């Protein structure tokens, strides 16, 4: 994208030596279009404003249609304004195209996206279906429809119909829809009914989908993306790194690989290679504290940098939305892990015995509060009884060791006195 820019810089000045002729809007619009994708958003904005001002001047260029040139420049300009933290100006510019040419699709599709930020039930779900009735042969507008049903996955099995609408041969082949099928089929995994010869068939079906979109497209990465997911679901983590390696190497800047790769690493007791992979996904400017990552972050952590620090990330996660039950359960499981790691074999510092009981008390208060909640993590939390029994015998061991604390107190007091007397000799 720098080469077209280098050519446009010189083509802009090479059109001034023959005569005093202003630059046509058609060159400024594309040079600003290149800079729109770049970080020169303000500069592309000046390019688009000047392309608008120049194309407006074409009062006799009725053959080249200055009007379509101002339309495309304003379209890129509202596309930029939506991206310049300004949806008000993008709405007004996109409505200025709607008021003059309602037979346009992208200006009508880009308006629903702006309201879809506030919620997936506003004029987005309505504008997206209104665009399809005017152009049902628009694969973009029809593929947008299935994206509405992705908010609520309750249309798991029933989405197959609406994804198989434009599966007619006139649209074929379409990798977008065929892979959306494999995705809606993979979402059906992670279920305990695999011994019922039900999920194995699902694996083989999605694998056939992937082999087909592989035979027709060897360079599509998403095809191998699901194949690695199934091979990992088959139990081959040793052989999933190799399939994900080709995907990582091509582009590893997709949010999915940073995670799919990170599960093998947390699988082979390499949290040292898994915790950075999770931070790197969170390097994107979209959130700071996600729940789903931090769920994957604590898996088999037992280490001193992996228990107390894991609480800090857990609190960072519950800080954004405490309403989840699994955060409130794991914060208790880690609290019990830490308290049993100071009140069983330790024989450790004295202040920590005072602090461990406070943590154990808080964990026990959470044990009672969790048990009254109705809904759970698709798994009833009736098994808190073993945790309560562990905290009981933990209370007994803490009351046994708090006396060791005082014994070590007398030990250190007599050590300091038997040292002070040696110093008095000198």
């Amino acid at each position: 994208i720098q080469g077209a820019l280098s050519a446009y810089g010189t083509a802009t000045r090479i059109l001034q030596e023959k005569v005093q002729a202003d630059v046509p809007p058609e060159i400024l619009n594309n040079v600003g279009a290149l800079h729109f994708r770049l970080g020169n958003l303000g500069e592309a904005k000046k390019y688009f404003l000047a392309s608008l001002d120049r194309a407006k001047a074409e009062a006799e260029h009725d053959e080249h249609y200055y009007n379509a040139i101002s339309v495309t420049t304003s379209y890129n300009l509202a596309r930029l304004y939506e991206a310049m933290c300004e949806f008000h100006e993008a709405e007004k510019l996109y409505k200025n195209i709607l008021r003059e040419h309602p037979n346009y699709v992208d200006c009508y599709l880009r308006l629903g996206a702006m309201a879809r930020d506030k919620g997936n039930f506003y004029e987005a779900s309505d504008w997206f279906k209104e665009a399809l009735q005017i152009n049902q042969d628009h694969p973009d507008a029809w593929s947008l429809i299935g994206n509405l049903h992705l908010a609520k996955q309750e249309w798991g099995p029933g989405q197959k119909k609406f994804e198989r609408i434009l599966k007619q041969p006139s649209t074929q082949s379409d990798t977008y829809s065929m892979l959306a099928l494999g995705n809606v089929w993979l979402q059906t995994l992670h279920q305990p009914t695999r011994d019922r010869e039900k999920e194995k068939r699902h694996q083989d079906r999605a694998l056939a989908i992937y082999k087909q979109v592989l035979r027709n497209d060897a360079k599509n990465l998403y095809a191998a993306n699901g194949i690695g997911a199934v091979l990992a679901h088959k139990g081959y983590f040793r052989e999933a790194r190799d399939v994900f390696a080709q995907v990582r190497e091509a582009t590893a800047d997709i949010s999915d690989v940073w995670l799919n790769l990170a599960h093998i690493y947390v699988e082979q007791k390499q949290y040292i290679s898994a915790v950075q992979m999770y931070e790197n996904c969170l390097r994107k400017f979209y959130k700071h504290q996600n729940t789903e990552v931090v769920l994957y972050l604590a898996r088999a952590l037992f280490k001193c940098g992996k228990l107390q620090e894991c609480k800090q990330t857990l609190l960072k996660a519950r800080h954004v939305a405490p309403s989840d039950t699994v955060l409130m359960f794991n914060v208790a499981l880690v609290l019990q892990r830490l308290a049993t790691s100071v009140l069983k074999d330790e024989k450790s510092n004295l202040k920590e015995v005072l602090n461990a009981v406070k943590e154990l008390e808080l964990a026990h208060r959470y044990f009672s509060y969790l048990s009254k909640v109705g809904d759970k993590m698709r798994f009833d939390l009736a098994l808190a009884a073993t945790e309560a029994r562990q905290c009981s015998d933990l209370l007994s061991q803490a009351q046994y060791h708090v006396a060791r604390a005082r014994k070590q107190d007398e030990e250190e007091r007599e050590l300091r006195a038997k040292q002070e007397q040696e110093k008095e000799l000198l």
Binding site: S143, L214, K219, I227, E239, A250, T251
Partner: protein
């Protein structure tokens, strides 16, 4: 109207959905289906 064919005929779409699926590079399936087939024979 003519405003549709006035714009769909001069613009340039360098990227679309299916572009996003393939790598920009050259990663055929000879190195993919090989392991994909090796995993099925061991089972």
């Amino acid at each position: 109207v003519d405003v549709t064919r006035d714009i769909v005929s001069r613009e340039r779409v360098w990227r679309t959905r299916t572009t996003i699926l393939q790598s920009t590079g050259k990663n055929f399936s000879k190195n993919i289906f090989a392991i994909l087939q090796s995993v099925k024979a061991r089972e």
